Design a protein around this ligand. Structure first.
Ligand SMILES: Nc1nc2c(ncn2[C@@H]2O[C@H](COP(=O)(O)OP(=O)(O)OP(=O)(O)O)[C@@H](O)[C@H]2O)c(=O)[nH]1
Ligand SMILES: Nc1nc2c(ncn2[C@@H]2O[C@H](COP(=O)(O)OP(=O)(O)OP(=O)(O)O)[C@@H](O)[C@H]2O)c(=O)[nH]1
Ligand SMILES: C=C1COc2cc3c(cc21)-c1c(cc(OC)c(OC)c1OC)CC[C@@H]3NC(C)=O
Ligand SMILES: C=C1COc2cc3c(cc21)-c1c(cc(OC)c(OC)c1OC)CC[C@@H]3NC(C)=O
Ligand SMILES: Nc1nc2c(ncn2[C@@H]2O[C@H](COP(=O)(O)OP(=O)(O)O)[C@@H](O)[C@H]2O)c(=O)[nH]1
Ligand SMILES: Nc1nc2c(ncn2[C@@H]2O[C@H](COP(=O)(O)OP(=O)(O)O)[C@@H](O)[C@H]2O)c(=O)[nH]1
Ligand SMILES: [Mg+2]
Ligand SMILES: [Mg+2]
Lengths: 131, 434, 430, 434, 429
């Protein structure tokens, strides 16, 4: 019913104006480069730390991998060692036993030789008396 | 002379840039080779001139991957741009804001600032920058916010205007787009003077409903977006009277600095295949500005308050018909302005009619209008995004991807708190006293 | 992110790997000599992802063939596309791993790993922008399982910035080569949880059940099982290999599918389920119905027993994009309780014009479901049944391993299942 | 690489070795002079090659008396072996374990080890040793256990597999064979990784029942044993569909170091004189593996528990048929596996058909199978031997012959206590868990 | 283990020893000159066990002939095959032993033993692998018993690692040469129990009873007795002399037949019981029936009065090995109570194609039966009857012996009896 047209500007290829239907209901109208560089550098150092931690975790894996191979070698070596000593002990125990069995057999037959000498000695003491 | 340098970041920014510069060339009679056979020297605000009469866009295209810019380098408009103003990396931000802002972005920021400085050196009265980018992409979100921060350091006074692509599940979205959107919005907020959000769902629906395209392509979407971008930049490229300089965008549309997100609404959008169409009157196209189906962002201004309204007409339009159309609007609907602002419209008519891309989907019309209104209703777009952000962040879903790139969890809550403050700011404007 | 370096390790890895190259070479128009004889410019547009261009415009798979036994790789070389592979990329030992994870990871495989890394390094250096690695292997044997996971950890150390993707074949008593499979599998998933970005769980239990129950094959062979695998592998990688709506990339896939780093084990699916022979015309609603069908899963898990954290559906063939979108929305509303509400828009759909060989239309499903905990629980039960009695353990301790390493692998897999259960019980209650 | 060195000890080991190497030569087309007109090359695991094309067995023949090895030195295959591979003493062990291990054995052990070392030097990837011997002979029992102990010192954990002849009264036994059997078993137990016992009574019964031989000779027995040995080594001497490595055998068969005695069962064993009857299917020969009539050791697996089952096929056999045959067996209740073993099966398939010695008793078949199953039932063989040992030892009968050679009575009770523990180990492995 | 050195001592030893060489020479096709005239390569295959090969491919028995009286050794030299023996291997004295064990063991035998050992040593040194020694002698006389046991102890001392086997002829009053035979026999078995590995007990009581009762010879001569001995010796050594199904070896035989060191006295048996020069056809069942027949035993013991610790049966001639196996199984099941159950598979059977002279088929039994205690009890009773009265004891004390040595020998033989009874009463429980 009541309009207000305020001719703002007119130019070669355009024309502008403001049309107010009703007025308002108020009296009054109502980082730096160092800082940004700091943020970007702080993010880069956080990312760098995370990657370092991952590579350290993977370095620990490699260390365990060479400890597994070493353990396999050490167990095999201890199996060879125990078998070598147990076998040497078994062959030594057997040599001692066989030596002892034969030594005892020698001694019992040597006793018989001594007894035979005693029998021959006893014949002399009986003889030379009769006739 | 008032030069404007356009910066297109990421796939969305680059592809939208292609459509805008194709349309600008058609509007100014510039051939794809830069030659222009010949309101008058106003196009020089967007185009510099070479000693061989070539007109080269005052633009820089940036992407952290080369494939999208490579199509520009080998496309129809390959001669239009100097190779130095097309900048590419080797690998993209993988839809990760932190990757685009902190890790990959740091690799090419100095190079892009050097090329923007080279364009600024060609300016006798640089107004500022127009930055095109997606909210969802890792480059569009992360690299853009890094660039905006550095531009504020190197060009303290210059206006910076954004054309941002708001995400929609219907148009090739990633799950983390709400994170990237809130992170970029938080960091860019204090560095942007005015931002025009373009909701992909709104553009997708207009293409389906008004252009009869069953499954719109990026070419269909971008050609429509470019018609709206062209309507808003027409006053910088021709001898206009409303929005003659980019400082005037802030003056006319954004009375409160943080609340710098105007709603764009365009009409008419008619299918080129629709025959016998009787040309729409000034009253018909003006009335269409208040229909939500024609908005660039899905929201409801009917349940909001206006703080500014700018009507940008193009073509066969006379002031008497515009004033009659505005008079009838007052009487039909209750369009409510905030207490401190007058209920009114700043109307500008640019005599140059709407230009259509030959072989496109839009029909050629005698007259068109783009309304730019600063309404509190646009906070509905923030609310939708913030809710999706909250659902995921409550579980810390995907945040390890960002932390892996050096960003802290504190930045997520800081960005979300800023969005909460922004939604509260729109609420403070939506109810006033004393 | 352009090139992918493919690695196939052990018997299973080389068998499914060879099938993969046969299938995708047919799709890309590459013949067994390496020459392109296709009639679509779409086949060559992204062929650089998997193939190197050689003299005489030949296409050579960026594939590295690994085994501790020469037998399998000789059979690959004599197979249909055996001649296509780069001869220098065949890296093989002579000892064999004897289906022993410890032999593949610590003993025999440790001797061959540097030789394989030399070939990987040579391929990687010729990449303009390497995306990452794709490994095919089984978890039940010794080379693919033990040496495959050793290769992964070595590769992670040298390429921490690249994506590590695997197609891991899970063991099943239904199709078994060794009594010691649950030990090898548990030790491998312990490695995969820590050192992979994405793992496709190809379950032999599921492949057998599909062949037996669905395809009605009373006695299925590895060839029948591998036909399902190759079809799945072709589908899962379609986005990477073809120009489509989606610009593809392995890192972008991981960012969109992996909300929590350890939860990167995908349940693949395929429709239609086909056997080798004279087949029959599937519809979009039918394709989408198979998304939730447990019968179509390549991992022996029922998706309706858990919730999807994220789901990717790839449709192939000439079809209506409007229809696919409407059917996908239908499935989501009528199966809302099997999707986590706290990850909005967690179901993504892609459509490729190029259908696979012999099918006019198909759908491949990639799901990050909490139901995958059923697969790990099965391996865990089988592991405990043996470990309880220390059965066959001397074959591992004999290689230098400690029982403690078994307890840790089992414990980490049990933690993995508790993590899946945690997100299965999580609601958007706030 | 993948070499295997065979060691044949005593009369039984040597005579079985003769039958094996005769069969291997016929299977590989090697003439008795070592010439092989000519491939697979898998035969190099068992045969080294001379610059003059001679293929010489990777084998050593040892006996404390010369008569048996002298028949090899003057026989058909005298040119096959280098004289240095055939080692003999002057006087045997006189059926006394103590003389084979100590008194007589000590005189030739170093020479034997030197000759084994010479063969190992020709290996680029030595898999291990296959040791053939009787349980009953003084050499077969005493010398073998001394050799196994020394091989563990010189080759550490390098795999050692045995083919042991278990004594039977029907087949030329000595009264003290139960003593020699328990003494060698105790001594060798920690040094053997897997041992295939061959019960002479089982072979005797198979020759009488299946081959219609009223009174089987050692030639009849050994030719049948060699068919089984060939089936288990064929996996190493040929490249078929599914190849089983020597390490793969044991990994799948031996759940605990001490429980390493698999039961071998072979089919089909049929008379060369029999009527037509067309070839046995894969299912028929596989089902025959679970029939006690075909076993190498007399025992009852139907009243025992299986721990592992390895099926080694040869000839006209395809995996689809094997899997179908295994599927049926898996549904049978008469075959109970221990609860701690998810799947006990492992299949090997070699395409080379079964070779028969011309003039032999076995009929030529298209396909055959040898099953190696680790069953608790094999402990019945230990129980029978231990009882015979107890009957004599309770009176100390004959033990003076062993003590005379340096052995101690304590070694008899130690060996018997180890056998008691072994029988108890077989009981514990079959008990159900929690 | 190839060569065996044979030693024959005293009258009896040289008489049965000569008969042994006559018998086996004919079996091996060797004539009295030492030339081979046979027509089977099996006769020469293992001829090295008992014969040395000499110039002109001659075969010389590895036999050493010993006696303190020149008499018997002159009769051997003049006998059939007397010229086959190595002349240097005849070692003889001139005094004689006068059926006195003390004379043979301690007095005149002690003077001659070193001379005999020199010949044994020479034969042993020409052996590629000496198995051991085989001694033929009587226990009732003085040289064979006294000097024979002295020889064995001296040989054991020099060759502790070799087997000592004897064919010991036991005395009997039915045959008799002197009342002091029980003394000589007891003193000798005391030596044999300690120093021999295996002893075949050839009992003159059994030989006389076979000749008198079975062969119906009212007055048997030593020639008639010796025919039974030579037949038994040929059978018992068949496995050593011929290539057969089993290897052979004296040590392997001892390890399989001797479960306890002292119980090494074998009860030989033979079938058919044949007359000294007569011709007359028995079946395998008939041959196997005689295993348990007391009438066929060369030791005067009834096997059914004890238990067999171990038994070896050797069949000779062309016969069915299947029939031998079935008949042997039959005998074992129907006589199970005569075999110790605590020595499994203690009955072994061997079959040789070569039959002995004059017989188409034969069977030799070698038994380690506890019933042999009947033989030792008989000698012990005869010994005690004399020793209670110290009868003829001055014959021995006159040579230097003490009455304590008699008490010890008697005690040792009584212990031997108690030991056989211990295992006869032992059960498997
Ligand atoms: N309207 C429109 N939206 C686009 C276009 N290209 C991409 N988008 C949208 O932008 C979002 C994804 O961001 P992109 O621009 O593709 O990503 P970017 O900036 O290249 O970053 P990267 O992740 O590093 O590739 C989604 O919502 C897309 O639908 C385009 O040309 N037009
Ligand atoms: N299967 C089979 N068993 C045999 C063979 N030769 C002997 N035997 C058995 O082995 C056991 C006797 O052991 P032998 O091998 O003859 O003795 P040895 O190892 O030569 O030892 P010595 O006592 O020193 O001769 C008995 O059970 C025989 O039946 C043969 O060639 N084949
Ligand atoms: C399940 C989800 C949640 O959000 C997603 C977004 C995307 C994907 C998966 C998901 C996705 C990607 C790459 C692919 O192959 C290389 C692929 O095919 C298997 C994919 O599934 C369609 C990564 C980018 C992709 N973005 C778009 C716009 O489609
Ligand atoms: C009474 C038994 C219990 O076990 C035995 C084993 C064997 C013998 C006797 C017994 C035996 C032997 C040597 C022989 O002459 C040299 C001989 O003939 C008298 C023999 O009797 C047949 C020793 C080896 C022989 N071995 C075989 C396999 O027959
Ligand atoms: N699906 C499939 N599984 C296989 C194939 N070959 C073997 N497997 C499985 O792989 C496991 C054994 O591992 P394998 O690769 O053969 O041994 P490796 O050479 O030591 O890695 C078992 O679970 C088998 O059932 C194959 O061709 N296809
Ligand atoms: N069977 C047999 N016994 C004999 C023979 N000659 C003597 N005897 C017995 O041997 C014992 C006497 O020993 P003898 O050898 O003659 O005395 P030596 O000369 O002192 O050894 C008595 O038991 C005689 O019956 C003989 O030729 N054959
Ligand atoms: Mg992009
Ligand atoms: Mg032998």
């Amino acid at each position: 019913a009541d309009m207000e047209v305020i001719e703002l500007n007119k130019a070669t290829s355009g024309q502008s104006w403001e049309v107010i239907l009703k007025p308002p209901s108020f009296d009054g109208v109502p980082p730096s480069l160092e800082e940004i560089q700091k943020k970007l550098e702080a993010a880069e150092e956080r990312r760098k730390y995370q990657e370092a931690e991952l590579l350290k975790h993977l370095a620990e894996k490699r260390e365990h991998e060479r400890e597994v191979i070493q353990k396999a070698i050490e167990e095999n070596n201890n199996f060879i060692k125990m078998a070598k000593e147990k076998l040497a002990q078994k062959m030594e125990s057997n040599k001692e036993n066989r030596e002892a069995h034969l030594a005892a057999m020698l001694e019992r037959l040597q006793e018989k030789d001594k007894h035979a000498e005693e029998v021959r000695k006893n014949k002399e003491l009986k003889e030379e008396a009769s006739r | 002379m008032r030069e404007c340098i356009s910066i297109h970041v990421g796939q969305a920014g680059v592809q939208i840039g292609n459509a805008c510069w194709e349309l600008y060339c058609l509007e100014h009679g510039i051939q794809p080779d830069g030659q222009m056979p010949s309101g008058d020297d106003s196009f020089n605000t967007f185009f510099s001139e070479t000693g061989a009469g070539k007109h080269v866009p005052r633009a820089v295209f940036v992407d952290l991957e080369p494939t999208v810019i490579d199509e520009v380098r080998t496309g129809t408009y390959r001669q239009l741009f100097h190779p130095e103003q097309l900048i590419t990396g080797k690998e993209d931000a993988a839809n990760n804001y932190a990757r685009g802002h902190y890790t990959i972005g740091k690799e090419i920021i100095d190079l892009v600032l050097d090329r923007i400085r080279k364009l600024a050196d060609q300016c006798t009265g640089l107004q500022g920058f127009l930055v095109f980018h997606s909210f969802g992409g890792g480059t569009g979100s992360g690299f853009t916010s890094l660039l905006m921060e550095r531009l504020s350091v190197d060009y303290g006074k210059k206006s910076k205007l954004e054309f941002s692509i708001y995400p929609a599940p219907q148009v090739s979205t990633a799950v983390v787009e709400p994170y990237n959107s809130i992170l970029t919005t938080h960091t860019t907020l204090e560095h942007s003077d005015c931002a025009f959000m373009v909701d992909n769902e709104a553009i997708y629906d207009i293409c389906r409903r008004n252009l009869d395209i069953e499954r719109p392509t990026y070419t269909n979407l971008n050609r429509l977006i470019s018609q709206i971008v062209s309507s808003i930049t027409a006053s910088l490229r021709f001898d206009g009277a409303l929005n003659v300089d980019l400082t005037e965008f802030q003056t006319n549309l954004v009375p409160y600095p943080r609340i710098h997100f105007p709603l764009a609404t365009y009409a008419p959008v008619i299918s080129a295949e629709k025959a016998y169409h009787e040309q729409l009157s000034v009253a018909e196209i003006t009335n269409a500005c208040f229909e939500p189906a024609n908005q660039m962002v899905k929201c409801d201004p009917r349940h909001g308050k206006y703080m500014a309204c700018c009507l940008l007409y193009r073509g066969d339009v006379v002031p008497k018909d515009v004033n009659a159309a505005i008079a009838t609007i007052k009487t039909k609907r209750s369009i409510q302005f905030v207490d401190w602002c007058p209920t009114g419209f700043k109307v500008g008519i640019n005599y140059q009619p709407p230009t259509v891309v030959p072989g496109g989907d839009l029909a050629k019309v005698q007259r068109a209008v783009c309304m730019l209104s600063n309404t509190t209703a646009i906070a509905e777009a923030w609310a939708r995004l913030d809710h999706k952000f909250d659902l995921m962040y409550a579980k810390r879903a995907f945040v390890h991807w960002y932390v892996g790139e050096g960003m802290e969890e504190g930045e997520f809550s800081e960005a979300r708190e800023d969005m909460a403050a922004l939604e509260k700011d729109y609420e403070e404007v939506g109810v006033d006293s004393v | 992110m352009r090139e992918i370096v493919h690695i196939q390790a052990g018997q299973c890895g080389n068998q499914i790997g060879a099938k993969f190259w046969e299938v995708i070479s047919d799709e890309h128009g590459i013949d067994p000599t390496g020459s392109y004889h296709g009639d679509s410019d779409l086949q060559l547009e992204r062929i650089n992802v998997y193939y190197n261009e050689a003299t005489g415009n030949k296409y050579v798979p960026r594939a590295i063939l690994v085994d501790l036994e020469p037998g399998t790789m000789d059979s690959v070389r004599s197979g249909p596309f055996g001649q296509i592979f780069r001869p220098d990329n065949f890296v093989f030992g002579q000892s064999g791993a004897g289906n022993n994870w410890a032999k593949g990871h610590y003993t025999e495989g440790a001797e061959l790993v540097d030789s394989v890394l030399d070939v990987v390094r040579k391929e990687s250096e010729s990449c303009d922008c390497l995306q990452g690695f794709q490994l095919t292997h089984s978890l039940g044997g010794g080379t693919g399982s033990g040496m495959g996971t050793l290769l992964i950890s070595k590769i992670r150390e040298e390429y921490p910035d690249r994506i590590m993707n695997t197609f891991s074949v899970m063991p099943s008593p239904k199709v078994s080569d060794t009594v010691v499979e649950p030990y090898n599998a548990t030790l491998s998933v312990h490695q995969l949880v820590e050192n992979t970005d994405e793992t496709y769980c190809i379950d032999n239990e599921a492949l057998y059940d599909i062949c037996f129950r669905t395809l009605k094959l009373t006695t299925p062979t590895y060839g029948d099982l591998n036909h399902l695998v190759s079809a799945t592998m072709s589908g899962v990688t379609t986005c990477l290999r073809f120009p489509g709506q989606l610009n593809a990339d392995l890192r972008k896939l991981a960012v969109n599918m992996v909300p929590f780093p350890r939860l990167h084990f995908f349940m693949p699916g395929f429709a239609p389920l086909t056997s080798r022979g004279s087949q029959q015309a599937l519809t979009v609603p039918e394709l989408t119905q198979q998304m939730f069908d447990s019968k179509n899963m390549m991992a022996a898990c029922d998706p309706r027993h858990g919730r999807y954290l994220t789901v990717a559906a790839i449709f192939r063939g000439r079809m209506s994009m409007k229809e696919v979108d409407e059917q996908m929305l239908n499935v989501q509303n009528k199966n809302s309780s099997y999707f986590v509400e706290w990850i909005p828009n967690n179901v993504k759909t892609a459509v490729c014009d190029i259908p696979p060989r012999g099918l006019k239309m198909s759908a491949t499903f990639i799901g990050n479901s909490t139901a995958i905990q059923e697969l790990f629980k099965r391996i865990s039960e089988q592991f405990t049944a043996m470990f309880r009695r220390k059965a066959f353990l001397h074959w591992y301790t004999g290689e230098g391993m400690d029982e403690m390493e078994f307890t840790e692998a089992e414990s980490n897999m049990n933690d993995l299942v508790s993590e899946y259960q945690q997100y299965q019980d999580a609601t958007a209650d706030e």
